[PDB]
Structures are given as structure tokens and as C-alpha cells.
Amino acid sequence: MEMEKEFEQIDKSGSWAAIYQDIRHEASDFPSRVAKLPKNKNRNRYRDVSPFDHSRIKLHQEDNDYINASLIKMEEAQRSYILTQGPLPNTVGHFWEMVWEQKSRGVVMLNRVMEKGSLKCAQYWPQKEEKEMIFEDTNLKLTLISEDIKSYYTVRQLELENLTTQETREILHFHYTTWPDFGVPESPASFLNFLFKVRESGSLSPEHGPVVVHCSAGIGRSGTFCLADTCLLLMDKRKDPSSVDIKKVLLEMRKFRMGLIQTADQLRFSYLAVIEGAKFIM
Ligand SMILES: NC(=S)Cn1cnc(Cl)c1Cl
């Protein structure tokens, strides 16, 4: 079926939970043996969210190459994303090592450091120009260059330096600051505006390594971001945009990381975002 009318048909019939459970039943299951080794317990935020072995990002380190991160490679859309968890106190250095080694231009953050009165990820970037951060385990230096605070999101320019080679690179930090503590946003308008700002920066483009995207577990909000982006790109590329099937795209992405889209409300919100974004395109 088309998307917008499939949408109203699920709303009128109130069957979002049944649609979402079908997705969960059909989703791929692949091994995640490296993630479950005992030496990696303090590298995982949640025991039930792990990268598959076949698609995990490897650190270029011979001691321990493990990080909770997955490469999502979308062949028809010609887009790649790295989806990861919010860094932990003992993985902030690994996180920036990955950004460096994978040649990423942008980092997309969809959570606040504290939500619901608890810490959802480490404070992994510097908050003042004159107070830079040094990650001694991976030999990197990170400096805040500039910061632009808007009503729904903040963009930061950062300088990452590889202290071994003295090479430097500019990283853009796109921070969506207004996702609610419970539920999903009422309108997708500010999320779509944010997606378009990331696109405009070049961070999603083939001349760079894959964008790094995260929330707390790296599957819920993060899944919504890449699912909406890929669906809109396919609607631009194809002769028949109504052939784009969001449930099929989601199942393809779930071949690369488990659990993408965590609730039936996130699924409905993803439909809403794609439906509204397609118009604005023309
Ligand atoms: N009809 C479409 S959108 C084909 N398809 C299904 N899943 C993905 Cl990804 C693609 Cl492409």
C-alpha cells in the first residue's frame, strides 16, 4: 500500500502495536559473540543491546578492538551510517578513536546528558573554548571552536587532533536537544528541520566517512533518524515514490543492528516524518 493511506488505515483501526510486533517477529537474528565476551562488559551500556559480529565497527587497536557500534550500509539509497550507544566514562576515548579512524565529518546526538533524573551518556565534548579535553588512552585532543544554540538544537564546531601525527580535523556536532523525556514529539517539523541541517553540512555525503549517530542505546531515536533519511532519499531517486515501503526499509536496516525503532509510537512517528518530509521536497 501507499504510505499516507496505510497510515490513516492503521490509525482508524488502532493496530500500531500489531504492526510493530510483526516487524519484531520478522527481524533478523545474527550472532553478537564479541560483545558478550567478559572483557567487554564495561564497554556496553545495556546488556540486551549489542552489535552483530558481521557489521560491528572495529577499532584499529590490537589489544581490544571492541566498541558498541554498527555500520548500517544502504545499497540502493547509497548512504551509510554508524549507529552507536551514548559513550560511557570508560569508552569516551574509544568513541573519538572511531570518529578519527572512520573519517567521519559529523556526530549526531539525539539525547540530553541527563534525562528522567539519570545520566544517559557521558559529557564527552568540551563546554568552554579554553578548557580542551585530552583522551590519554587513545592519544587524541578535542577543542571547542564555536557553538550556535537554537531553539530546538545546537551546532558545534570541534577540532580533533591526533597527537601521534599532529594531524587535525574539523568535526561538526549536531545536537537535537528537545526530544521529550517520555513519548515522541507531537509534530515532526523540528526533527525534519534538524535532518535537513545535517544534510546541508555535507556530513551525510560520500566524500566523507559515515556519520556517527547516537542516543542512549543507539537504536530508538537513532533508528528514527536514519530510517527517515533513507526513505526520503529513495522517494527522490525512484520513478514511483509511492513504491517506497517503510516497513521493508526498516527490516533491511535491522539486518545490520538489532532493535531499531523501540516502540510503536516511534514507528508511527517515523511514518509521520516521512509523509510530511516528502511534500516539502516537491
Ligand atoms: N521498495 C523499496 S523502498 C525497496 N526496498 C525495500 N527495502 C529497502 Cl532498503 C529497499 Cl530499497
Tab-separated table of C-alpha atoms and ligand atoms in Angstrom:
chain	number	residue	atom	x	y	z
A	1	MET	CA	0.000	0.000	0.000
A	2	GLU	CA	0.996	3.645	-0.248
A	3	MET	CA	2.248	5.278	2.942
A	4	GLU	CA	-0.163	8.122	3.821
A	5	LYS	CA	-3.274	5.994	3.404
A	6	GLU	CA	-1.796	2.921	5.025
A	7	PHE	CA	-1.133	5.415	7.846
A	8	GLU	CA	-4.754	6.531	8.258
A	9	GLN	CA	-5.869	2.912	7.951
A	10	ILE	CA	-3.687	1.941	10.937
A	11	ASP	CA	-4.843	4.976	12.926
A	12	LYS	CA	-8.537	4.281	12.312
A	13	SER	CA	-8.074	0.581	13.120
A	14	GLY	CA	-5.754	1.259	16.083
A	15	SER	CA	-3.345	-1.533	15.116
A	16	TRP	CA	0.083	0.124	15.578
A	17	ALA	CA	1.092	-2.398	18.251
A	18	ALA	CA	0.245	-5.324	15.961
A	19	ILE	CA	2.168	-3.865	13.021
A	20	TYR	CA	5.188	-3.194	15.239
A	21	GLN	CA	5.132	-6.712	16.718
A	22	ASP	CA	5.134	-8.200	13.192
A	23	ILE	CA	8.344	-6.278	12.487
A	24	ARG	CA	9.897	-7.612	15.698
A	25	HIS	CA	8.923	-11.189	14.752
A	26	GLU	CA	10.399	-10.972	11.228
A	27	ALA	CA	13.624	-9.173	12.199
A	28	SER	CA	16.996	-10.806	11.577
A	29	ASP	CA	18.923	-12.598	14.308
A	30	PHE	CA	22.688	-12.838	13.918
A	31	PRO	CA	25.434	-13.613	16.449
A	32	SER	CA	26.993	-10.953	18.719
A	33	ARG	CA	29.695	-13.098	20.333
A	34	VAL	CA	32.402	-10.422	20.609
A	35	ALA	CA	30.025	-8.082	22.505
A	36	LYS	CA	29.321	-10.777	25.111
A	37	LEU	CA	32.937	-11.642	25.978
A	38	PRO	CA	33.599	-10.958	29.697
A	39	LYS	CA	36.396	-8.463	28.990
A	40	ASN	CA	33.850	-6.202	27.235
A	41	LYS	CA	31.217	-5.968	29.973
A	42	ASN	CA	32.137	-2.396	30.912
A	43	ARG	CA	32.047	-1.387	27.198
A	44	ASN	CA	28.271	-1.969	26.936
A	45	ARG	CA	25.646	0.317	28.414
A	46	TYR	CA	22.777	-2.195	28.189
A	47	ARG	CA	23.074	-5.989	28.309
A	48	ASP	CA	20.306	-6.523	25.739
A	49	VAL	CA	21.680	-4.092	23.061
A	50	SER	CA	24.710	-5.443	21.209
A	51	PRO	CA	26.225	-5.055	17.737
A	52	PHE	CA	26.166	-8.088	15.416
A	53	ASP	CA	29.607	-9.543	14.685
A	54	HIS	CA	29.204	-9.239	10.918
A	55	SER	CA	28.551	-5.461	10.940
A	56	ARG	CA	30.368	-4.160	14.052
A	57	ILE	CA	32.918	-1.336	13.842
A	58	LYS	CA	36.426	-2.446	14.777
A	59	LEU	CA	38.885	-0.133	16.494
A	60	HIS	CA	42.400	-0.161	14.998
A	61	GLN	CA	43.951	-1.468	18.183
A	62	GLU	CA	45.456	-4.912	18.704
A	63	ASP	CA	44.689	-5.264	22.434
A	64	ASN	CA	40.895	-4.897	22.280
A	65	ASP	CA	39.136	-3.785	19.099
A	66	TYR	CA	35.591	-3.715	20.528
A	67	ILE	CA	33.101	-0.817	20.568
A	68	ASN	CA	29.303	-0.980	20.731
A	69	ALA	CA	28.780	0.416	17.217
A	70	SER	CA	27.374	-0.896	13.892
A	71	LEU	CA	27.792	0.016	10.204
A	72	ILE	CA	24.373	0.310	8.510
A	73	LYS	CA	25.072	0.210	4.711
A	74	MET	CA	22.062	1.050	2.469
A	75	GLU	CA	22.859	-0.163	-1.044
A	76	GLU	CA	20.040	1.265	-3.191
A	77	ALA	CA	19.984	4.618	-1.361
A	78	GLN	CA	23.809	4.863	-1.420
A	79	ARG	CA	24.034	6.027	2.202
A	80	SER	CA	25.966	4.631	5.154
A	81	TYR	CA	25.533	5.369	8.884
A	82	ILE	CA	27.360	4.307	12.051
A	83	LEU	CA	24.883	3.799	14.910
A	84	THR	CA	26.352	3.638	18.430
A	85	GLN	CA	25.404	3.935	22.092
A	86	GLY	CA	25.989	7.089	24.108
A	87	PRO	CA	29.602	6.919	25.291
A	88	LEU	CA	30.370	5.613	28.801
A	89	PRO	CA	33.012	7.027	31.191
A	90	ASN	CA	35.380	4.250	30.093
A	91	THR	CA	34.630	4.488	26.332
A	92	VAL	CA	34.873	8.229	25.538
A	93	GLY	CA	38.387	7.711	24.169
A	94	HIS	CA	37.260	4.755	22.023
A	95	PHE	CA	34.402	6.880	20.662
A	96	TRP	CA	36.710	9.602	19.327
A	97	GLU	CA	39.178	6.992	18.083
A	98	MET	CA	36.312	5.578	15.966
A	99	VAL	CA	35.372	9.041	14.648
A	100	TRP	CA	39.015	9.545	13.629
A	101	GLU	CA	39.625	6.095	12.088
A	102	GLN	CA	36.364	6.068	10.108
A	103	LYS	CA	36.960	9.639	8.711
A	104	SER	CA	33.573	10.886	9.843
A	105	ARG	CA	32.730	14.573	9.431
A	106	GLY	CA	29.672	14.763	11.690
A	107	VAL	CA	28.350	13.422	15.012
A	108	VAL	CA	24.549	13.388	15.538
A	109	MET	CA	23.347	13.359	19.219
A	110	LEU	CA	19.617	12.843	19.881
A	111	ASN	CA	19.567	12.804	23.719
A	112	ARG	CA	20.453	15.051	26.677
A	113	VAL	CA	23.250	14.029	29.048
A	114	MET	CA	20.673	13.810	31.854
A	115	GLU	CA	17.074	12.691	31.272
A	116	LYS	CA	14.462	11.489	33.791
A	117	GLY	CA	16.947	12.386	36.576
A	118	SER	CA	19.598	9.840	35.448
A	119	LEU	CA	22.731	10.007	33.271
A	120	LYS	CA	22.115	8.837	29.697
A	121	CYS	CA	25.674	9.364	28.381
A	122	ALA	CA	28.996	10.861	29.421
A	123	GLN	CA	29.896	14.547	28.931
A	124	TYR	CA	32.175	13.638	26.036
A	125	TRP	CA	32.906	17.052	24.465
A	126	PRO	CA	34.286	20.314	25.933
A	127	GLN	CA	31.924	23.063	27.027
A	128	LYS	CA	34.381	26.018	27.016
A	129	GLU	CA	36.900	27.077	24.347
A	130	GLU	CA	39.753	27.479	26.811
A	131	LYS	CA	39.203	24.046	28.531
A	132	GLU	CA	40.101	21.386	25.961
A	133	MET	CA	39.922	17.590	26.557
A	134	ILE	CA	42.725	15.049	26.254
A	135	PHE	CA	41.992	11.300	25.917
A	136	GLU	CA	45.225	9.666	27.046
A	137	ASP	CA	44.271	6.045	26.315
A	138	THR	CA	43.806	6.844	22.571
A	139	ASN	CA	46.127	9.895	22.275
A	140	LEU	CA	43.593	12.443	20.977
A	141	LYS	CA	42.895	16.101	21.792
A	142	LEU	CA	39.486	17.768	21.353
A	143	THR	CA	38.813	21.556	21.436
A	144	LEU	CA	35.569	23.544	21.231
A	145	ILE	CA	35.884	26.094	18.384
A	146	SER	CA	32.381	27.629	18.239
A	147	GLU	CA	28.808	26.932	19.326
A	148	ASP	CA	25.467	28.063	17.851
A	149	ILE	CA	22.463	27.496	20.156
A	150	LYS	CA	18.992	27.474	18.608
A	151	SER	CA	15.554	26.714	19.987
A	152	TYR	CA	15.428	23.006	19.105
A	153	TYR	CA	19.080	22.095	18.510
A	154	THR	CA	22.689	23.250	18.905
A	155	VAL	CA	25.530	23.010	16.327
A	156	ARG	CA	29.131	22.970	17.498
A	157	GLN	CA	32.415	23.152	15.636
A	158	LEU	CA	35.115	20.958	17.177
A	159	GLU	CA	38.789	20.337	16.388
A	160	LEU	CA	40.060	16.779	16.799
A	161	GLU	CA	43.846	16.309	16.814
A	162	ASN	CA	45.684	13.006	16.540
A	163	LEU	CA	48.528	13.670	18.970
A	164	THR	CA	50.677	10.884	17.449
A	165	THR	CA	50.822	12.527	13.996
A	166	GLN	CA	49.761	16.127	14.831
A	167	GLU	CA	47.096	15.911	12.102
A	168	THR	CA	43.917	17.913	12.808
A	169	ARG	CA	40.342	17.705	11.507
A	170	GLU	CA	37.146	19.707	11.890
A	171	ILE	CA	34.152	17.724	13.305
A	172	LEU	CA	30.580	19.076	13.356
A	173	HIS	CA	28.412	18.164	16.388
A	174	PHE	CA	24.658	18.275	15.677
A	175	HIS	CA	22.770	18.082	18.982
A	176	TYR	CA	18.985	17.698	18.971
A	177	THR	CA	18.060	18.992	22.451
A	178	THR	CA	14.245	18.874	22.623
A	179	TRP	CA	13.147	15.228	22.281
A	180	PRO	CA	10.755	14.719	25.242
A	181	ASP	CA	11.689	12.607	28.283
A	182	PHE	CA	8.614	10.410	27.575
A	183	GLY	CA	6.972	9.570	24.234
A	184	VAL	CA	7.753	11.226	20.873
A	185	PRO	CA	7.362	14.790	19.550
A	186	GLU	CA	3.825	15.853	18.641
A	187	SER	CA	4.904	17.311	15.266
A	188	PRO	CA	7.864	16.088	13.140
A	189	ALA	CA	8.593	19.596	11.904
A	190	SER	CA	11.608	20.376	14.117
A	191	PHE	CA	13.116	16.882	13.656
A	192	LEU	CA	12.885	17.280	9.855
A	193	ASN	CA	14.386	20.775	10.020
A	194	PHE	CA	17.265	19.239	12.007
A	195	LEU	CA	17.757	16.431	9.454
A	196	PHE	CA	17.954	18.993	6.638
A	197	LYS	CA	20.608	20.960	8.561
A	198	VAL	CA	22.734	17.813	8.901
A	199	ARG	CA	22.328	17.131	5.168
A	200	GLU	CA	23.254	20.704	4.197
A	201	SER	CA	26.546	20.443	6.110
A	202	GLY	CA	27.956	17.663	3.923
A	203	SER	CA	28.150	15.213	6.856
A	204	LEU	CA	25.963	12.592	5.126
A	205	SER	CA	27.740	12.776	1.772
A	206	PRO	CA	30.030	10.222	0.047
A	207	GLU	CA	33.133	12.433	0.216
A	208	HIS	CA	33.319	11.706	3.979
A	209	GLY	CA	33.250	8.631	6.181
A	210	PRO	CA	29.859	7.637	7.623
A	211	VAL	CA	28.098	9.972	10.022
A	212	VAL	CA	28.146	8.768	13.666
A	213	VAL	CA	24.632	8.832	15.232
A	214	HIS	CA	23.683	8.052	18.848
A	215	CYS	CA	21.128	8.403	21.586
A	216	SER	CA	21.320	6.445	24.816
A	217	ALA	CA	21.169	2.868	23.418
A	218	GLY	CA	21.739	3.790	19.762
A	219	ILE	CA	18.613	2.043	18.401
A	220	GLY	CA	15.480	4.099	19.131
A	221	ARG	CA	15.721	7.809	18.274
A	222	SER	CA	18.848	6.892	16.314
A	223	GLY	CA	16.810	4.428	14.239
A	224	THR	CA	14.179	7.057	13.544
A	225	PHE	CA	16.832	9.424	12.162
A	226	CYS	CA	18.384	7.034	9.607
A	227	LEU	CA	15.048	5.434	8.620
A	228	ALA	CA	13.531	8.829	7.757
A	229	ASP	CA	16.622	9.984	5.876
A	230	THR	CA	16.867	6.799	3.751
A	231	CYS	CA	13.151	6.707	2.930
A	232	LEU	CA	13.141	10.345	1.725
A	233	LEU	CA	16.243	9.733	-0.411
A	234	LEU	CA	14.613	6.689	-2.069
A	235	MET	CA	11.452	8.729	-2.793
A	236	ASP	CA	13.651	11.221	-4.706
A	237	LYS	CA	15.592	8.560	-6.638
A	238	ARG	CA	12.758	6.283	-7.837
A	239	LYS	CA	10.340	6.758	-10.730
A	240	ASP	CA	7.413	5.819	-8.453
A	241	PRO	CA	7.825	7.349	-4.961
A	242	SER	CA	4.737	5.533	-3.678
A	243	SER	CA	6.663	2.260	-4.073
A	244	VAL	CA	8.814	3.085	-1.012
A	245	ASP	CA	7.807	0.670	1.769
A	246	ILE	CA	8.945	1.958	5.171
A	247	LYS	CA	8.444	-1.419	6.884
A	248	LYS	CA	10.686	-3.117	4.308
A	249	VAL	CA	13.353	-0.436	4.669
A	250	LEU	CA	13.293	-0.882	8.451
A	251	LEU	CA	13.693	-4.652	8.147
A	252	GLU	CA	16.664	-4.163	5.802
A	253	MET	CA	18.316	-1.826	8.364
A	254	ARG	CA	17.667	-4.372	11.132
A	255	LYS	CA	19.944	-6.796	9.265
A	256	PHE	CA	22.792	-4.530	10.470
A	257	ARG	CA	21.790	-3.560	14.034
A	258	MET	CA	19.208	-5.108	16.364
A	259	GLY	CA	16.186	-3.319	17.780
A	260	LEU	CA	15.974	-0.239	15.562
A	261	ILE	CA	12.759	1.607	16.463
A	262	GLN	CA	11.958	0.713	20.073
A	263	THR	CA	8.190	1.368	20.383
A	264	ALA	CA	5.041	1.503	18.234
A	265	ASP	CA	4.949	5.261	18.934
A	266	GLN	CA	8.408	5.652	17.375
A	267	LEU	CA	7.190	3.650	14.358
A	268	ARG	CA	4.159	5.923	13.936
A	269	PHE	CA	6.373	8.997	14.327
A	270	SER	CA	8.692	7.684	11.586
A	271	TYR	CA	5.742	7.374	9.203
A	272	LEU	CA	4.625	10.904	10.106
A	273	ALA	CA	8.091	12.334	9.477
A	274	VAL	CA	8.459	10.709	6.057
A	275	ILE	CA	4.936	11.691	4.941
A	276	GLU	CA	5.480	15.342	5.874
A	277	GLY	CA	9.043	15.491	4.579
A	278	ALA	CA	8.086	14.256	1.102
A	279	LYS	CA	5.901	17.308	0.430
A	280	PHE	CA	8.492	19.835	1.411
A	281	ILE	CA	10.816	18.277	-1.119
A	282	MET	CA	8.440	18.750	-4.036
B	1	LIG	N1	10.649	-0.647	-2.429
B	1	LIG	C1	11.728	-0.269	-1.669
B	1	LIG	S1	11.749	1.042	-0.830
B	1	LIG	C2	12.864	-1.440	-1.719
B	1	LIG	N2	13.416	-1.609	-0.556
B	1	LIG	C3	12.936	-2.252	0.485
B	1	LIG	N3	13.750	-2.145	1.491
B	1	LIG	C4	14.805	-1.305	1.047
B	1	LIG	CL1	16.168	-0.739	1.936
B	1	LIG	C5	14.502	-1.038	-0.196
B	1	LIG	CL2	15.140	-0.222	-1.114
